[PDB]
DNA sequence: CGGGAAAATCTCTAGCA
DNA sequence: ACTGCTAGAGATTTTCCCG
DNA sequence: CGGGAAAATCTCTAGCA
DNA sequence: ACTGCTAGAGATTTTCCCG
């Protein structure tokens, strides 16, 4: 599996780990605390 | 008949990008245009570029320059 | 590499040393030090250094609002060409946006519009307008202006032009229209050395022409190909290479191991 | 190259336009244009019509692209020079408007419209328009029930007319027709620009007298000499400016 | 090329067409169109696309204030090494800055300090402190934070580290000192794979050692060289190349056309 | 001589032309309206 | 290479430190360290002393780097554990403090100072400090008239002592001496790190029994076999991990 | 005497930059150190770098690695 | 084939707020 | 399941042009 | 000399506000 | 007369290691 850490929206605090549901060209879809979010890969790190 | 249409469709120029490079690749030749993909020839190289990354024009200045002629 | 690992883990829990420091100070190989750093949530504070690419299909427009002298300017840009439309609107509301958008859709073939999540663009009125005009709505990731990078850039360009010609008009709306004219027809460059107006004309005309030509070719030409599997459909044969489609998958193969029926 | 004689024969036997000879025989457009121009015997896109109609007690300013039938209409608060000038400025910014035809109404003759035409570089000269207005009213009546204000209905009618009404020689819509016409006009402008660029030079081949330059190639140069078009290699030809 | 120029000039005065548009629409060569654009004040709206480079001499420190949780943190960085010092101060004032600066000057050889134009850094008290400690003061171009890039970057780094350890301390000052420790000794990378503390030690020690060695060499070695002009002073000879100093100018010449006396 | 057009300090409006007194690695010194100013080369254009 | 015998002879005739043998004969420090450690007969940088002095009814916390004489002094509002812990944390952040020596005062024995030493990884163990305090008081008195507050005078005195007072074997300042000592300590730590990295591998040369690995160069390998150091071509030697 | 000091001064490593490139050039060799200039050797190339663009260190890890030895 | 000017391509930046 | 870009200022590299 | 893992170098980004 | 930089995340390129 993958651990994703992300900077959600105007919040300077990084969050995660979140599950990686999907990975695209310039964005990813993740699930954190049973909440689906869409994050630019600029604002995400996958491990 | 078919040859004329193929030559016409090959007269068009394509400017595209690769998945990781932001600069636009020069005027490649158009071979096939689909709903979501364009097959182009770029210096003896045949590439399939997704539709969302291709700008297809018939550059009119070059057309009137006669560059398409052999 | 066990006692070193334990000492490095304690040192990291206290200080969050990076992998180089731990590798140096605890005789650890880089892989294990990096694993230590990677297993710590508190040290994941940076996203991958890259940029995506926006959609540039012939039918996509990017819309955004901008502000100048206390007035709201609605701006649309045809992504493929850089051709812009703009106008002052009294209020940054869904009704004015929907009227602007219906106007745009009646003058150019707008298949999709891409915007940020400003309230005016998410209003039900704009949704109804898009539904009537057969327009698909795409919203960027919230608070990610890069997703609208084209129109944002054009916001910078339009404003610049507006500053060049602000003294030729009494009212800001006239200056906005003057700047739209200047950008669309009096600035040349980019792909084809065109202006945005000629570029958009060329792009749309090329779309129609290539669609018709490909339709005629498909009507006339029909063949099946077997390559290194099922009966794929040929698209272009020549130069020792053949391009085929098999179950919505386009592949280019050498002339060898390819039979055309 | 090696097809100029065929082009001349085809022009004599058909008097076809330069585009047909350039495409069929694969010749540079400059060469074909010179060929067609030589024969003495065989010797619009930017024109718009403006009008104001009335419906439901409101003024609708309508602009028609004559060559294409493409329509741009807007409800204006009042039939004044300022509103017309703003509408015309917008139209010019969005399409290559070269000439506007009006009906001598006070708004169109206003100094505001004159200033707008001057800045935009548009020329003003005082039954397509009336029929267009008739069809626009028909569409507005058809779609009036789906809207709440007149301006929205007018925009919906413009949309339907420009992109949803197909009919004519090829069954195209007005939008496609105007796009094609403007593309052809751009082609023509580019051809004229390259003719202007090329015609300023002279060529001496093999040494014969000065000759008109037509086309320069990688290893071939096409020139004209006394109503005769010839192909000469670059090494044997010298190109100068006078 | 005189008829097109007038029309292009009028067209530009109205629209400010760029040089490509004028060259296309008036049969003008690129040079003349560019000259038209260059002669217009209203079209000069963009500076040259480049970046300078900050001074990185061994004696320069970059100082700046930053804010966190409603408190002021004064931060200094040794440019050559990236070694930082920091502390919370109750007020963003010249007195506290001068106390901080005198402290720093007594613990490391501070020859020059580079800061922005914040009031605390321009105060007479800080000037007096620098005068007493023999410190030269450099101020960046106002509202050009890039001139203090290093320290600005370090601000970002410091804050990051603070966020990593903020829960290990009750007070912000303790967290600041913890972050200073972590940066100076627990983060390795950059030049030499060092930490900032090791790097600064190496930089300063190398400065002293090379100064002494060069002084001894100059005391022992003394020669004059003639190349091509005058009796220049040799600095290093060998490998088919001679380095000389003449009129406070350093020149590297091939072994040919060079005589050493 | 040289004409310099520059963006001065937090003011988005470009100014000039100003005389070029001096040109450095990453900055220039100019004279506009009898006032000497120092501008990063990023914020200046010399003609 | 080809200087190990000379290094051994020099050590026998002088018993010089490994640095001298490495520098004189141009040998890798690992080889010289092995040579010097082989002979049984021939077989501090991070130590600080803390104290609190008093002047003008104010508490001054003074830290002395024993090896170098380099001082860091502050005026603290109160002789409390919290102030001492903050001072120690700062010192540790600015210099590689390994151990601190105190006089058993209440502030130094406080749980706060113990926590600070634990987090910073400092070891605490309860006539240099007194002499340094006397010198600091002398300097403060000399410069007391140039300032207005005691803290400023204390910092000026620290500056003068660390960088303006020269005297000793080479006439160097305390700042220079501490920089040199810390540089030497880094040198030593890196040497130890590479010795630790290399000691985990064994070498078989020409096939003889396992031998200790000392250096792996670009075209030769320096090893030790039964208190004898030898050079081997790379091809003839195999290095493995046990 | 002089040779030993020259070799020692040449043991030092220099990291520098050119006037228009922001990345730091690798560990060149030190030849001469002046008030405002440092003369370095970088792959058989002798360059004069201004003082404000040079970081001069004796990389201690490399020194203990014996890399300075022949 | 040899140089020089021109044209083209490449590199890099601010502002969009 | 989505995504930085635009246009201008210099720098540098091909390319064309007469011997 | 041949491949593969590792080490090194290269490319690129946010945040400093 | 002064000047963007830092450190981390991947990508790609040398370099070392046993046959
Ligand atoms: C209330 C709506 C909806 C929610 O988001 C806000 C805030 N916002 C912010 C920027 C902005 O920060 N632009 C600067 C910028 C920075 C980087 C880049 F790549 C492109 C850029 F334009 C906008 O442009 C913008 O339109 C909005 C906006 O509309 N809204
Ligand atoms: C009142 C003082 C004196 C006058 O100037 C102001 C405003 N200012 C602004 C920034 C700032 O905008 N930083 C962001 C940033 C942007 C780009 C970049 F390259 C580096 C960067 F740090 C500062 O950091 C800063 O210290 C100050 C400051 O102190 N002052
Ligand atoms: Mg917006
Ligand atoms: Mg915006
Ligand atoms: Mg500041
Ligand atoms: Mg700052
Ligand atoms: Zn951590
Ligand atoms: Zn202008």
- Domain map of chain H by residue range? 2-60
Q: Could you tell me the resolution of this structure in angstroms? A: 2.0
With CA atoms as reference, report the closest residue to C120 among C96, C84, C142, C144. Answer: C96
Contact C2, C27 (CB under 8 A): no
D12 & D89 share domain: no
Q: Is residue E208 part of a domain?
A: no
Burial pattern D162-179, b for ≥16 Cβ within 10 A else e, equals bbeeeeeeeebbbbbbbb
With CA atoms as reference, report the closest residue to C19 among C32, C10, C6. Answer: C32
Sheet holding D229-233, edge to edge: D229-233, D220-224, D211-216, D201-205, D237-241
C162 & C64 share domain: yes
Tokens matching residue H56: 């001069």
Q: Which residue of C has its CA nearest to E190?
A: C20
Write out residues with Cβ below 6 Å of ligand 1: C 64, 116-118, 143, 145-146, 149, 152
Q: Cα(F42) to centroid of ligand 1, in Å? A: 24
Technique used by the depositors: cryo-EM
Q: Say yes or no for a CB contact (<8 Å) between C209 and B37.
A: no
CA distance linking residue G75 with residue G77, whole number of Å: 7
CA distance linking residue G82 with residue G116, whole number of Å: 9
- Fold designation for H2-60: SH3 type barrels. (2.30.30)
Residues in CB range of G121: below 8 A, 6 or more apart: none
Tokens matching residue C249: 């998958």
Tell me which chain F residues have a C-beta less than 8 angstroms from the C-beta of E41: 5, 16-17
Contact B16, B53 (CB under 8 A): yes
| Among E residues 92-121, those touching chain H with beta carbons less than 8 Å apart | none
Breaks (C–N over 2.5 Å) after residues, chain G: 43, 126, 206
Q: How many CB atoms lie within 10 A of CB C195?
A: 29
Q: Is residue C122 part of a domain?
A: yes
Q: Say yes or no for a CB contact (<8 Å) between A44 and C47.
A: yes
Does D74 show up as a binding residue in the annotation?
A: no
Residues in CB range of G95: below 8 A, 6 or more apart: E197, G65, G72, G178, G182
CA distance linking residue F44 with residue E245, whole number of Å: 35
Distances (CA, A) of D104 to D6, D101, D116, D121, D124: 52, 9, 16, 19, 10
What residue numbers bound the domain in which G225 lies?
199-242
With CA atoms as reference, report the closest residue to G82 among E177, D11, C34, D136. Answer: E177
G17 & G92 share domain: no
- Where does G31-69 show beta strands of DSSP type E? 47-55, 58-65
Tokens matching residue E52: 């300078």
Q: How many residues does chain F have?
A: 47
D147 & D60 share domain: yes
Burial pattern B14-42, b for ≥16 Cβ within 10 A else e, equals bbbbeeeeeebbebbebbbbeeebbbbbe
Distance A24 CA to K7 C1' (A): 30
C127 & C79 share domain: yes
> Residue G176: exposed, middle, or buried by beta-carbon count in 10 A (0-12, 13-18, 19+)?
buried
Measure the CA angle with vertex C240, ends C234 and C246; round to 5°.
25
Residues of chain C that touch chain G, judged by Cβ-Cβ distance less than 8 Å: 14, 24, 27
Tokens matching residue C141: 């990731």
Distances (CA, A) of F35 to E143, F29, F31, F32: 18, 10, 5, 5
D54 & D91 share domain: yes
> What is the 3-class SS of chain D, one letter each residue?
CCCHHHHHHHHHHHCCCHHHHHHHHCCCHHHHHHHHHHCCCCCCCCEEEEEEEEECCEEEEEEEECCCCCEEEEEECCCCHHHHHHHHHHHHHHCCCCEEECCCCHHHHCHHHHHHHHHHCCEEECCHHHHHHHHHHHHHHHHHHHCCCHHHHHHHHHHHHHHHCCCCCCCCCHHHHHHHHHHHHHHHHHHHHHHHHHHCEEEEECCCCCEEEEEECCCEEEEECCCCEEEEECCCEEEEEC
CA distance linking residue D239 with residue D199, whole number of Å: 11
Q: How many CB atoms lie within 10 A of CB D105?
A: 16
Q: Is residue C132 part of a domain?
A: yes
Q: Say yes or no for a CB contact (<8 Å) between D197 and E24.
A: no
Tell me which chain E residues have a C-beta less than 8 angstroms from the C-beta of C21: 186-188, 195
Contact C66, C153 (CB under 8 A): no
**In this structure, what CATH number is given to the domain that contains residue D35?**
1.10.10.200
Nucleotide with C1' nearest the E48 CA: J9
With CA atoms as reference, report the closest residue to C82 among C185, C211, C210. Answer: C185
CA distance linking residue G193 with residue C22, whole number of Å: 12
Q: Please, which contacts does G123-126 make with residues 24 or more away whose CB atoms are closer than 8 Å?
A: G123/G98, G123/G99, G124/G99, G124/G100, G125/G99, G125/G100, G125/G101, G126/G101, G126/G102
Q: Which of C78, C88, C95, C106 would best serve as a mutation to test chain D binding (most D beta carbons within 10 A)?
A: C106
Phi, psi of E119 (to 5 degrees): -55, -40
Contact D76, D60 (CB under 8 A): yes
Q: How many residues does chain E have?
A: 261
Question: What is the CATH code for A3-46?
Answer: 2.30.30.10
Q: Cα(E196) to centroid of ligand 5, in Å? A: 22
With CA atoms as reference, report the closest residue to E107 among E133, E82, E81, E127. Answer: E133
Contact G178, E207 (CB under 8 A): no
Q: Say yes or no for a CB contact (<8 Å) between E217 and H46.
A: no
Work out the end-to-end distance of chain F between its first and last CA atoms, rounded to an integer number of angstroms. Answer: 9
Of all atoms in ligand 1, which is nearest to the CA of residue C155?
22
Tell me which chain D residues have a C-beta less than 8 angstroms from the C-beta of B64: 29-30, 187, 190-191, 194
The crossing angle, in degrees rounded to 10, of helices E196-220 and H2-10 is: 150
CA–chain centroid gap for H54, Å, is 8
Q: How many CB atoms lie within 10 A of CB D85?
A: 24
E24 & E109 share domain: no
Contact D228, D219 (CB under 8 A): no
Tokens matching residue G76: 């603290």
Q: Say yes or no for a CB contact (<8 Å) between E52 and F40.
A: yes
Which residue has tokens 């590689």? G96
D221 upstream amide cis, omega within 30 of 0: no
Q: Is residue E179 part of a domain?
A: yes
- D123, β-bridge pairs: D99
Work out the end-to-end distance of chain C between its first and last CA atoms, rounded to an integer number of angstroms. Answer: 64
Burial pattern C208-241, b for ≥16 Cβ within 10 A else e, equals bbbeebbeebeeeeeeebebeeeebebbbbeeeb
With CA atoms as reference, report the closest residue to E96 among G79, G154, G151. Answer: G151
Of all atoms in ligand 1, which is nearest to the CA of residue C117?
3
Does G42 show up as a binding residue in the annotation?
A: yes
Q: Cα(G22) to centroid of ligand 6, in Å? A: 48
CA dihedral C101, C104, C108, C112 (to 10 degrees): -20
Q: Does G187 touch chain H (CB under 8 A)?
A: yes
Query: Alpha helices of chain C — where are they, by DSSP H?
Result: 3-15, 19-25, 30-38, 94-107, 119-122, 124-132, 149-164, 172-185, 196-220
Q: Is residue D209 part of a domain?
A: yes
Q: Say yes or no for a CB contact (<8 Å) between C27 and G197.
A: yes
Tokens matching residue G153: 């005078």
Write out residues with Cβ below 6 Å of ligand 2: E 64, 116-118, 143, 145-146, 149, 152
With CA atoms as reference, report the closest residue to E64 among E122, E106, E114. Answer: E114
Tokens matching residue G167: 């005297």
Tokens matching residue D118: 């001057």
Residue spans of the domains in chain F: they are 4-46
Contact E192, E199 (CB under 8 A): yes
CA distance linking residue C252 with residue C247, whole number of Å: 14
With CA atoms as reference, report the closest residue to B45 among B19, B18, B7, B67. Answer: B18
Q: How many CB atoms lie within 10 A of CB F36?
A: 12
Tokens matching residue F2: 């040289």
Number of helices (H) and strands (E), helices first, in chain A?
A: 0, 5
Q: How many CB atoms lie within 10 A of CB D77?
A: 9
- Choice from C152, C153, C155, C159 to test ligand 1 binding pocket (greatest atom count within 8 A of CB): C152
Residues of chain G that touch chain E, judged by Cβ-Cβ distance less than 8 Å: 72, 86, 89-90, 92-96, 119-120, 146, 151-152, 155-156, 158-159, 162-163, 175-176, 179-180, 182-183, 186
CATH 2.30.30.10 fits B2-57, yes or no: yes
Contact D46, D96 (CB under 8 A): yes
C175 & C119 share domain: yes
Contact B69, B11 (CB under 8 A): no
CA distance linking residue F15 with residue E258, whole number of Å: 52
CA atoms within 13 A on the CB side of C39: 11
CA distance linking residue G50 with residue E223, whole number of Å: 53
CA distance linking residue C169 with residue C57, whole number of Å: 35
- Choice from C116, C120, C143, C146 to test ligand 1 binding pocket (greatest atom count within 8 A of CB): C116
D112 & D127 share domain: yes
| Among H residues 6-45, those touching chain E with beta carbons less than 8 Å apart | 6, 8-9, 12-13, 15, 17, 19-20, 22, 24, 30-34, 37, 39, 41, 44
Tell me which chain C residues have a C-beta less than 8 angstroms from the C-beta of G196: 27
Q: Is residue D190 part of a domain?
A: no
Which residue has tokens 């014969």? D208
Contact E87, E58 (CB under 8 A): no
Contact C257, C228 (CB under 8 A): yes
Residues of E (18-47) placing their beta carbon closer than 7 angstroms to any atom of strand I are 29-31, 46-47
The crossing angle, in degrees rounded to 10, of helices C196-220 and D174-199 is: 110
Nucleotide with C1' nearest the E141 CA: L2
3-class SS shares of chain G: helix, strand, coil, % to 5: 45, 25, 30
CATH 2.30.30.10 fits F4-46, yes or no: yes
Tell me which chain C residues have a C-beta less than 8 angstroms from the C-beta of A6: 47
Pairing, β E112-115 against β E136-139: parallel
C82 & C167 share domain: yes
- C168, β-bridge pairs: none
The crossing angle, in degrees rounded to 10, of helices G29-38 and G174-198 is: 80
Tokens matching residue D128: 């397509």
CA distance linking residue H2 with residue E216, whole number of Å: 9
Q: Is residue E71 part of a domain?
A: yes
Total of domains in chain E: 3
Q: Cα(G137) to centroid of ligand 4, in Å? A: 64
Q: How many CB atoms lie within 10 A of CB E212?
A: 13
Q: Say yes or no for a CB contact (<8 Å) between G186 and H60.
A: yes
Contact C179, C162 (CB under 8 A): yes
CA–chain centroid gap for G191, Å, is 13
Tell me which chain E residues have a C-beta less than 8 angstroms from the C-beta of G182: 201
Number of helices (H) and strands (E), helices first, in chain F?
A: 0, 5
CA atoms within 13 A on the CB side of B69: 25
F35 upstream amide cis, omega within 30 of 0: no
CA distance linking residue E118 with residue E142, whole number of Å: 9
Tell me the torsion sign for CA atoms B55, B61, B62, B68.
Answer: positive
Q: Which residue of G has its CA nearest to H67?
A: G28
With CA atoms as reference, report the closest residue to E164 among E179, E142, E181. Answer: E179
Q: Cα(C80) to centroid of ligand 1, in Å? A: 21
Q: How many CB atoms lie within 10 A of CB H44?
A: 8
Tell me the torsion sign for CA atoms E222, E226, E231, E235.
Answer: negative
E190 & E228 share domain: no
Contact G43, G18 (CB under 8 A): no
Q: Is residue G186 part of a domain?
A: no
Of all atoms in ligand 1, which is nearest to the CA of residue C116?
3
E37 & E71 share domain: no
**In this structure, what CATH number is given to the domain that contains residue D171?**
3.30.420.10
Give the closest residue (by CA) to ligand 2 atom 11. Answer: E145
């Amino acid at each position: 599996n993958f651990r994703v850490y992300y900077r959600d929206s105007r919040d300077p605090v990084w969050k995660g780990p979140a599950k990686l549901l999907w990975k695209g060209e310039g964005a990813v879809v993740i699930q954190d605390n049973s909440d689906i979010k869409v994050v630019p890969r600029r604002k995400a790190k996958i491990i | 008949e078919l040859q004329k249409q193929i030559t016409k469709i090959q007269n068009f120029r394509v400017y595209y990008r690769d998945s990781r490079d932001p600069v636009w690749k020069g005027p490649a030749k158009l071979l096939w245009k689909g709903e979501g993909a364009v097959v182009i020839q770029d210096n003896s190289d045949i590439k399939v570029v997704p539709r969302r990354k291709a700008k297809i024009i018939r550059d009119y200045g070059k057309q009137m320059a006669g560059d398409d002629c052999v | 590499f066990l006692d070193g690992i334990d000492k490095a883990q304690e040192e990291h829990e206290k200080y969050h040393s990076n992998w180089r420091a731990m590798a140096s100070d605890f005789n650890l190989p880089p892989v294990v030090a990096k694993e230590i750093v990677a297993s710590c949530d508190k040290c994941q504070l940076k996203g991958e250094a890259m940029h995506g690419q926006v959609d540039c299909s012939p039918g996509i427009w990017q819309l955004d609002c901008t502000h100048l002298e206390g007035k709201v300017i609605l701006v649309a840009v045809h992504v493929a060409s850089g051709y812009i439309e703009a106008e002052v609107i009294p209020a940054e509301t869904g009704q004015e946006t929907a009227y602007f958008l219906l106007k745009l859709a009646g003058r150019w073939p707008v298949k999709t519009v891409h915007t940020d999540n400003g309230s005016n663009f998410t209003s039900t009125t704009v949704k109804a307008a898009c539904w009537w005009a057969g327009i698909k709505q795409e919203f960027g990731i919230p608070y990610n202006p890069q997703s609208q990078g084209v129109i944002e850039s054009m916001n910078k360009e339009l404003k610049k032009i507006i500053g060049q010609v602000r003294d030729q008009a009494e009212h800001l709306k006239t200056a906005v229209q003057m700047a739209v004219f200047i950008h669309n027809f009096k600035r040349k460059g980019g792909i084809g050395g065109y202006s945005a107006g000629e570029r958009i004309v060329d792009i749309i005309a090329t779309d129609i022409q290539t669609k018709e030509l490909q339709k005629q070719i498909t009507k006339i030409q029909n063949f099946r190909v077997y390559y290194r599997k099922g009966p794929a459909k040929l698209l272009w044969k020549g130069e020792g290479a053949v391009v085929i489609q098999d179950n919505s998958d386009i592949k280019v193969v050498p002339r060898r191991k390819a039979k055309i029926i």
